[PDB]
Protein backbone atom coordinates (compact mmCIF):
# COMPACT_ATOMS: atom_id res chain seq x y z
CA UNK A 1 0.00 0.00 0.00
CA UNK A 2 1.32 3.41 -1.04
CA UNK A 3 0.57 6.95 0.20
CA UNK A 4 -2.94 8.27 -0.38
CA UNK A 5 -4.93 11.41 0.48
CA UNK A 6 -7.65 11.94 3.12
CA UNK A 7 -10.08 12.73 0.28
CA UNK A 8 -9.72 9.16 -1.06
CA UNK A 9 -9.79 7.18 2.19
CA UNK A 10 -13.51 6.41 1.93
CA UNK A 11 -14.06 4.50 -1.32
CA UNK A 12 -10.52 4.50 -2.77
CA UNK A 13 -10.15 3.81 -6.47
CA UNK A 14 -9.72 0.05 -6.87
CA UNK A 15 -8.11 0.36 -10.30
CA UNK A 16 -5.47 2.62 -8.74
CA UNK A 17 -4.89 0.13 -5.93
CA UNK A 18 -4.75 -2.61 -8.56
CA UNK A 19 -2.07 -0.60 -10.39
CA UNK A 20 -0.11 0.13 -7.20
CA UNK A 21 0.46 -3.63 -7.14
CA UNK A 22 2.30 -3.47 -10.48
CA UNK A 23 4.30 -0.21 -10.24
CA UNK A 24 6.26 -0.60 -7.00
CA UNK A 25 9.60 1.08 -7.86
CA UNK A 26 9.49 4.61 -6.43
CA UNK A 27 13.22 5.34 -6.77
CA UNK A 28 14.59 8.06 -9.05
CA UNK A 29 16.56 6.23 -11.74
CA UNK A 30 15.70 8.09 -14.97
CA UNK A 31 17.25 11.35 -16.10
CA UNK A 32 14.62 14.04 -15.35
CA UNK A 33 15.91 16.09 -18.31
CA UNK A 34 15.05 13.36 -20.85
CA UNK A 35 11.64 12.21 -19.62
CA UNK A 36 9.95 14.10 -22.46
CA UNK A 37 12.04 12.16 -25.00
CA UNK A 38 11.34 8.81 -23.35
CA UNK A 39 7.62 9.62 -23.50
CA UNK A 40 7.28 11.35 -26.89
CA UNK A 41 8.71 10.27 -30.24
CA UNK A 42 7.57 13.38 -32.11
CA UNK A 43 4.60 15.53 -33.10
CA UNK A 44 1.33 13.86 -34.00
CA UNK A 45 -2.42 14.37 -33.74
CA UNK A 46 -5.56 12.30 -33.36
CA UNK A 47 -6.23 12.28 -37.11
CA UNK A 48 -3.05 11.30 -39.00
CA UNK A 49 -3.50 13.43 -42.13
CA UNK A 50 -3.81 16.55 -39.96
CA UNK A 51 -0.33 17.99 -39.46
CA UNK A 52 0.81 19.80 -36.30
CA UNK A 53 2.40 23.24 -36.43
CA UNK A 54 6.09 22.89 -35.62
CA UNK A 55 6.22 26.00 -33.42
CA UNK A 56 3.31 24.94 -31.20
CA UNK A 57 4.73 21.43 -30.76
CA UNK A 58 7.92 23.07 -29.49
CA UNK A 59 5.99 25.26 -27.04
CA UNK A 60 4.06 22.32 -25.57
CA UNK A 61 7.06 19.98 -25.49
CA UNK A 62 9.18 22.45 -23.52
CA UNK A 63 6.59 23.17 -20.83
CA UNK A 64 5.80 19.46 -20.71
CA UNK A 65 9.48 18.63 -20.17
CA UNK A 66 9.52 21.02 -17.20
CA UNK A 67 6.40 19.49 -15.65
CA UNK A 68 7.84 15.99 -16.01
CA UNK A 69 11.07 17.29 -14.48
CA UNK A 70 9.27 18.77 -11.46
CA UNK A 71 6.91 15.80 -11.04
CA UNK A 72 9.65 13.16 -11.22
CA UNK A 73 11.95 14.81 -8.67
CA UNK A 74 9.32 15.75 -6.06
CA UNK A 75 6.62 13.05 -6.34
CA UNK A 76 7.42 9.44 -5.51
CA UNK A 77 4.00 8.39 -6.79
CA UNK A 78 4.82 9.80 -10.23
CA UNK A 79 8.18 8.02 -10.42
CA UNK A 80 6.46 4.68 -9.80
CA UNK A 81 4.18 5.33 -12.77
CA UNK A 82 7.03 6.61 -14.95
CA UNK A 83 9.52 3.89 -14.01
CA UNK A 84 6.99 1.12 -14.57
CA UNK A 85 6.00 2.66 -17.91
CA UNK A 86 9.66 2.59 -19.00
CA UNK A 87 10.11 -1.14 -18.34
CA UNK A 88 6.94 -2.05 -20.22
CA UNK A 89 6.96 0.35 -23.19
CA UNK A 90 9.04 3.50 -23.29
CA UNK A 91 12.48 1.85 -23.33
CA UNK A 92 11.40 0.65 -26.77
CA UNK A 93 11.44 3.55 -29.18
CA UNK A 94 8.59 2.45 -31.47
CA UNK A 95 6.17 2.28 -28.51
CA UNK A 96 6.37 5.97 -27.57
CA UNK A 97 3.57 8.53 -27.78
CA UNK A 98 2.76 11.23 -30.32
CA UNK A 99 2.19 14.75 -28.98
CA UNK A 100 -0.91 16.40 -30.41
CA UNK A 101 0.12 19.93 -29.50
CA UNK A 102 -2.69 22.46 -29.79
CA UNK A 103 -5.46 19.85 -30.01
CA UNK A 104 -8.01 19.15 -27.29
CA UNK A 105 -6.85 17.46 -24.09
CA UNK A 106 -7.05 13.71 -24.52
CA UNK A 107 -5.10 10.47 -24.52
CA UNK A 108 -5.72 7.37 -26.63
CA UNK A 109 -6.21 4.61 -24.06
CA UNK A 110 -9.42 2.89 -25.27
CA UNK A 111 -9.69 0.28 -28.01
CA UNK A 112 -12.15 2.71 -29.59
CA UNK A 113 -9.74 5.65 -29.26
CA UNK A 114 -7.03 3.67 -31.06
CA UNK A 115 -9.49 2.65 -33.77
CA UNK A 116 -10.24 6.37 -34.15
CA UNK A 117 -6.53 7.30 -34.33
CA UNK A 118 -5.65 4.59 -36.90
CA UNK A 119 -4.06 2.63 -34.07
CA UNK A 120 -1.71 5.48 -33.15
CA UNK A 121 -0.83 6.44 -29.58
CA UNK A 122 -1.42 10.17 -29.09
CA UNK A 123 -1.48 12.53 -26.12
CA UNK A 124 -3.05 15.87 -27.05
CA UNK A 125 -2.12 19.01 -25.11
CA UNK A 126 -2.54 22.76 -25.58
CA UNK A 127 -1.70 26.04 -23.84
CA UNK A 128 -5.09 27.76 -24.19
CA UNK A 129 -4.52 29.45 -20.83
CA UNK A 130 -3.30 32.93 -21.81
CA UNK A 131 -11.13 32.12 -22.85
CA UNK A 132 -13.73 29.85 -21.24
CA UNK A 133 -11.90 27.94 -18.47
CA UNK A 134 -12.56 24.38 -17.38
CA UNK A 135 -13.62 23.75 -13.78
CA UNK A 136 -13.50 20.71 -11.51
CA UNK A 137 -15.35 19.81 -8.33
CA UNK A 138 -13.58 20.31 -5.00
CA UNK A 139 -14.51 20.34 -1.33
CA UNK A 140 -13.86 24.10 -1.65
CA UNK A 141 -16.16 24.48 -4.66
CA UNK A 142 -15.33 24.62 -8.36
CA UNK A 143 -11.71 25.37 -9.23
CA UNK A 144 -10.19 26.23 -12.60
CA UNK A 145 -7.78 23.84 -14.27
CA UNK A 146 -4.14 24.85 -14.27
CA UNK A 147 -1.86 23.52 -16.99
CA UNK A 148 0.01 21.48 -14.37
CA UNK A 149 -3.15 19.52 -13.52
CA UNK A 150 -4.31 19.32 -17.14
CA UNK A 151 -0.94 18.01 -18.33
CA UNK A 152 -0.45 15.58 -15.44
CA UNK A 153 -3.96 14.19 -15.96
CA UNK A 154 -3.32 13.30 -19.60
CA UNK A 155 0.14 11.93 -18.77
CA UNK A 156 -1.25 9.60 -16.11
CA UNK A 157 -3.62 8.32 -18.80
CA UNK A 158 -0.60 7.46 -20.96
CA UNK A 159 1.62 5.93 -18.27
CA UNK A 160 -1.16 3.75 -16.82
CA UNK A 161 -3.48 3.22 -19.82
CA UNK A 162 -6.39 3.69 -17.39
CA UNK A 163 -9.60 5.59 -18.08
CA UNK A 164 -11.46 8.04 -15.86
CA UNK A 165 -14.78 6.18 -15.56
CA UNK A 166 -14.62 3.55 -12.80
CA UNK A 167 -17.56 1.60 -11.41
CA UNK A 168 -18.50 2.60 -7.85
CA UNK A 169 -15.91 5.41 -7.59
CA UNK A 170 -16.70 9.10 -8.27
CA UNK A 171 -13.18 10.06 -9.40
CA UNK A 172 -11.53 7.14 -11.15
CA UNK A 173 -7.87 6.17 -10.78
CA UNK A 174 -6.43 8.89 -13.04
CA UNK A 175 -7.87 11.77 -11.02
CA UNK A 176 -6.65 10.22 -7.77
CA UNK A 177 -3.15 9.66 -9.18
CA UNK A 178 -3.24 13.26 -10.41
CA UNK A 179 -4.33 14.47 -6.96
CA UNK A 180 -1.65 12.46 -5.14
CA UNK A 181 1.08 13.70 -7.49
CA UNK A 182 0.20 17.41 -7.47
CA UNK A 183 0.25 17.42 -3.66
CA UNK A 184 3.67 15.75 -3.56
CA UNK A 185 4.81 18.49 -5.95
CA UNK A 186 3.67 21.07 -3.39
CA UNK A 187 0.74 22.17 -5.55
CA UNK A 188 -1.77 24.36 -3.71
CA UNK A 189 -4.91 23.72 -5.79
CA UNK A 190 -7.36 21.59 -3.76
CA UNK A 191 -7.97 17.95 -4.70
CA UNK A 192 -10.54 17.02 -7.33
CA UNK A 193 -13.32 15.18 -5.49
CA UNK A 194 -15.30 14.02 -8.54
CA UNK A 195 -14.73 13.47 -12.24
CA UNK A 196 -18.01 15.00 -13.42
CA UNK A 197 -18.80 18.68 -12.87
CA UNK A 198 -22.01 20.20 -11.49
CA UNK B 1 31.28 31.32 -46.32
CA UNK B 2 32.35 31.87 -42.70
CA UNK B 3 35.45 29.87 -41.79
CA UNK B 4 35.35 28.44 -38.26
CA UNK B 5 38.21 27.72 -35.84
CA UNK B 6 40.90 25.35 -37.08
CA UNK B 7 44.18 23.94 -35.82
CA UNK B 8 47.71 24.99 -36.84
CA UNK B 9 48.15 21.46 -38.25
CA UNK B 10 45.39 21.94 -40.87
CA UNK B 11 46.05 25.39 -42.37
CA UNK B 12 48.20 24.00 -45.18
CA UNK B 13 45.79 21.94 -47.30
CA UNK B 14 42.70 22.11 -45.06
CA UNK B 15 40.02 19.53 -45.73
CA UNK B 16 37.69 20.98 -48.36
CA UNK B 17 34.89 18.59 -47.40
CA UNK B 18 35.12 19.81 -43.79
CA UNK B 19 35.02 23.45 -44.89
CA UNK B 20 32.16 22.58 -47.25
CA UNK B 21 30.33 21.10 -44.26
CA UNK B 22 31.15 24.12 -42.09
CA UNK B 23 28.94 26.10 -44.47
CA UNK B 24 25.87 23.99 -43.64
CA UNK B 25 26.27 23.34 -39.90
CA UNK B 26 26.66 26.90 -38.63
CA UNK B 27 24.70 26.89 -35.33
CA UNK B 28 27.25 26.62 -32.51
CA UNK B 29 24.85 27.44 -29.65
CA UNK B 30 24.05 24.94 -26.90
CA UNK B 31 20.34 24.20 -27.37
CA UNK B 32 20.08 20.42 -26.81
CA UNK B 33 20.15 18.75 -23.40
CA UNK B 34 23.66 17.22 -23.05
CA UNK B 35 22.27 14.43 -20.85
CA UNK B 36 19.94 13.21 -23.62
CA UNK B 37 22.27 13.38 -26.64
CA UNK B 38 22.78 9.61 -26.52
CA UNK B 39 19.01 9.18 -26.81
CA UNK B 40 18.82 11.58 -29.76
CA UNK B 41 21.62 9.64 -31.50
CA UNK B 42 20.90 5.99 -30.62
CA UNK B 43 17.56 4.20 -30.68
CA UNK B 44 18.83 0.93 -29.23
CA UNK B 45 21.30 -1.94 -29.58
CA UNK B 46 22.17 -3.21 -33.05
CA UNK B 47 25.13 -4.57 -34.99
CA UNK B 48 26.52 -4.61 -38.51
CA UNK B 49 24.97 -8.00 -39.26
CA UNK B 50 21.26 -8.00 -38.30
CA UNK B 51 21.01 -11.67 -37.33
CA UNK B 52 23.79 -11.12 -34.77
CA UNK B 53 22.24 -9.81 -31.55
CA UNK B 54 24.05 -7.57 -29.05
CA UNK B 55 24.73 -8.51 -25.44
CA UNK B 56 22.45 -6.56 -23.12
CA UNK B 57 25.14 -5.92 -20.51
CA UNK B 58 27.73 -4.72 -23.05
CA UNK B 59 25.30 -2.32 -24.75
CA UNK B 60 24.78 -0.69 -21.35
CA UNK B 61 28.53 -0.29 -20.76
CA UNK B 62 29.18 1.39 -24.12
CA UNK B 63 26.06 3.58 -24.01
CA UNK B 64 26.99 4.88 -20.55
CA UNK B 65 30.55 5.87 -21.47
CA UNK B 66 29.24 7.27 -24.76
CA UNK B 67 26.68 9.43 -22.97
CA UNK B 68 29.48 10.94 -20.88
CA UNK B 69 31.66 11.63 -23.94
CA UNK B 70 28.85 13.35 -25.85
CA UNK B 71 28.06 15.39 -22.73
CA UNK B 72 31.69 16.52 -22.49
CA UNK B 73 31.97 17.23 -26.21
CA UNK B 74 28.70 19.14 -26.47
CA UNK B 75 29.31 21.41 -23.48
CA UNK B 76 32.98 22.22 -24.20
CA UNK B 77 33.33 22.12 -28.00
CA UNK B 78 31.43 24.57 -30.18
CA UNK B 79 32.56 22.72 -33.31
CA UNK B 80 30.88 19.59 -31.95
CA UNK B 81 27.70 21.54 -31.21
CA UNK B 82 27.46 22.70 -34.83
CA UNK B 83 27.67 19.08 -36.00
CA UNK B 84 25.29 17.71 -33.37
CA UNK B 85 22.70 20.47 -33.79
CA UNK B 86 22.86 20.25 -37.58
CA UNK B 87 22.44 16.48 -37.38
CA UNK B 88 19.36 16.97 -35.16
CA UNK B 89 17.44 19.23 -37.55
CA UNK B 90 18.11 16.94 -40.52
CA UNK B 91 17.65 13.46 -39.04
CA UNK B 92 17.81 12.80 -35.31
CA UNK B 93 14.74 14.83 -34.36
CA UNK B 94 13.01 12.14 -36.40
CA UNK B 95 12.97 8.93 -34.41
CA UNK B 96 13.12 6.44 -37.30
CA UNK B 97 16.39 8.00 -38.54
CA UNK B 98 18.45 7.27 -35.42
CA UNK B 99 21.44 4.95 -35.16
CA UNK B 100 21.89 1.44 -33.82
CA UNK B 101 24.76 0.89 -31.38
CA UNK B 102 26.89 -2.14 -32.21
CA UNK B 103 28.35 -2.38 -28.74
CA UNK B 104 31.40 -4.61 -28.51
CA UNK B 105 31.94 -4.88 -32.26
CA UNK B 106 34.82 -3.29 -34.14
CA UNK B 107 34.86 0.48 -34.62
CA UNK B 108 32.95 1.49 -37.73
CA UNK B 109 29.99 3.50 -38.98
CA UNK B 110 27.70 2.84 -41.95
CA UNK B 111 27.93 5.99 -44.08
CA UNK B 112 28.46 4.61 -47.62
CA UNK B 113 25.82 3.04 -49.83
CA UNK B 114 28.12 0.01 -49.83
CA UNK B 115 28.29 -0.05 -46.03
CA UNK B 116 24.48 0.10 -45.97
CA UNK B 117 24.27 -2.74 -48.51
CA UNK B 118 26.24 -4.90 -46.07
CA UNK B 119 24.06 -3.96 -43.07
CA UNK B 120 20.73 -4.62 -44.84
CA UNK B 121 20.16 -0.87 -44.95
CA UNK B 122 20.44 -0.35 -41.18
CA UNK B 123 22.25 2.61 -39.62
CA UNK B 124 24.70 1.31 -37.02
CA UNK B 125 27.69 2.76 -35.15
CA UNK B 126 29.98 0.07 -33.74
CA UNK B 127 31.96 0.78 -30.56
CA UNK B 128 33.88 -1.31 -28.06
CA UNK B 129 35.78 -1.02 -24.78
CA UNK B 130 38.22 -3.87 -25.43
CA UNK B 131 46.16 -10.45 -27.80
CA UNK B 132 46.69 -8.24 -30.87
CA UNK B 133 48.67 -5.16 -31.89
CA UNK B 134 47.16 -1.89 -30.56
CA UNK B 135 46.09 0.87 -32.93
CA UNK B 136 48.30 3.91 -33.54
CA UNK B 137 47.93 7.18 -35.45
CA UNK B 138 50.31 9.73 -36.94
CA UNK B 139 51.19 12.81 -34.92
CA UNK B 140 53.98 15.38 -35.10
CA UNK B 141 55.16 13.86 -31.78
CA UNK B 142 55.44 10.32 -33.15
CA UNK B 143 52.97 7.43 -33.11
CA UNK B 144 50.20 7.64 -30.52
CA UNK B 145 47.82 4.91 -29.39
CA UNK B 146 44.08 5.58 -29.50
CA UNK B 147 42.10 6.37 -26.36
CA UNK B 148 38.40 5.55 -26.25
CA UNK B 149 37.58 9.27 -26.21
CA UNK B 150 39.10 9.73 -29.68
CA UNK B 151 37.74 6.43 -31.00
CA UNK B 152 34.17 7.28 -30.00
CA UNK B 153 34.32 10.88 -31.25
CA UNK B 154 35.78 9.71 -34.57
CA UNK B 155 32.94 7.27 -35.22
CA UNK B 156 30.35 9.80 -34.03
CA UNK B 157 31.61 12.42 -36.51
CA UNK B 158 31.06 9.82 -39.23
CA UNK B 159 27.44 9.57 -38.08
CA UNK B 160 26.70 13.27 -37.62
CA UNK B 161 28.25 14.31 -40.97
CA UNK B 162 27.91 11.17 -43.13
CA UNK B 163 31.43 11.95 -44.36
CA UNK B 164 34.12 9.32 -44.88
CA UNK B 165 37.84 9.37 -44.18
CA UNK B 166 38.98 8.97 -47.79
CA UNK B 167 39.53 12.36 -49.44
CA UNK B 168 41.43 13.07 -52.64
CA UNK B 169 44.15 15.69 -52.07
CA UNK B 170 43.95 15.60 -48.26
CA UNK B 171 46.07 13.30 -46.06
CA UNK B 172 43.64 13.26 -43.10
CA UNK B 173 40.09 13.59 -44.42
CA UNK B 174 37.37 15.78 -42.92
CA UNK B 175 36.37 13.36 -40.14
CA UNK B 176 39.86 13.23 -38.60
CA UNK B 177 40.26 17.01 -38.75
CA UNK B 178 36.89 17.51 -37.07
CA UNK B 179 37.99 15.01 -34.42
CA UNK B 180 41.26 16.89 -33.89
CA UNK B 181 39.47 20.24 -33.58
CA UNK B 182 36.95 18.79 -31.13
CA UNK B 183 39.38 16.94 -28.86
CA UNK B 184 41.41 20.14 -28.52
CA UNK B 185 38.29 22.14 -27.63
CA UNK B 186 37.56 19.45 -25.02
CA UNK B 187 41.04 20.08 -23.61
CA UNK B 188 42.43 16.72 -24.75
CA UNK B 189 46.20 16.42 -24.39
CA UNK B 190 46.89 13.76 -27.03
CA UNK B 191 48.55 15.41 -30.06
CA UNK B 192 46.59 15.98 -33.28
CA UNK B 193 46.33 13.24 -35.90
CA UNK B 194 48.29 14.50 -38.90
CA UNK B 195 47.41 11.69 -41.33
CA UNK B 196 44.78 8.98 -41.69
CA UNK B 197 47.19 6.25 -42.85
CA UNK B 198 50.81 6.15 -41.74
CA UNK B 199 53.25 7.88 -44.08
CL1 LIG C 1 -10.24 14.23 -20.01
CL1 LIG D 1 37.58 4.07 -39.14
ZN1 LIG E 1 -9.26 12.04 -18.40
ZN1 LIG F 1 36.83 6.64 -39.88
Residue numbers in the entry:
A (entry chain B): 27 to 156, 160 to 227
B (entry chain A): 25 to 154, 159 to 227
How does the study describe this entry?
Here, we report that the zinc metalloprotease T3SS effector proteins GtgA, GogA, and PipA from S. enterica cleave a subset of NF-κB subunits comprising p65, RelB, and cRel, whereas NleC from EPEC/EHEC cleaves all five NF-κB subunits. The active-site helix (αG) sits at the bottom of a cleft formed between an upper NSD and a lower CSD. Similar to NleC, the active-site cleft of GtgA is highly negatively charged, and the active-site cleft mimics the shape of the DNA major groove.
GtgA(20–228)E183Q crystals belong to space group I121 with two molecules in the a.u. that overlap with a root mean square deviation (RMSD; Cα of residues 27–154 and 160–227) of 0.2 Å. This is likely a crystallization artifact, as the elution volume of GtgA(20–228)E183Q following size-exclusion chromatography was indicative of a monomeric protein, and the disulfide bond is absent in the structure of the GtgA–p65 complex. The active site of GtgA is surrounded by a large negatively charged surface formed by αF, the upper rim residues, and the loop connecting helices αC and αD, which folds down over the incomplete ψ-loop. An overlap of the apo-GtgA with the GtgA chain in the complex structures demonstrates that this region clashes sterically with residues in the p65 NTD chain. In GtgA, the ψ-loop motif is incomplete as, in both the complex and apo structures, the lowermost strand residues Phe-131 to Val-135, which form the upper rim, are not in the β-sheet.
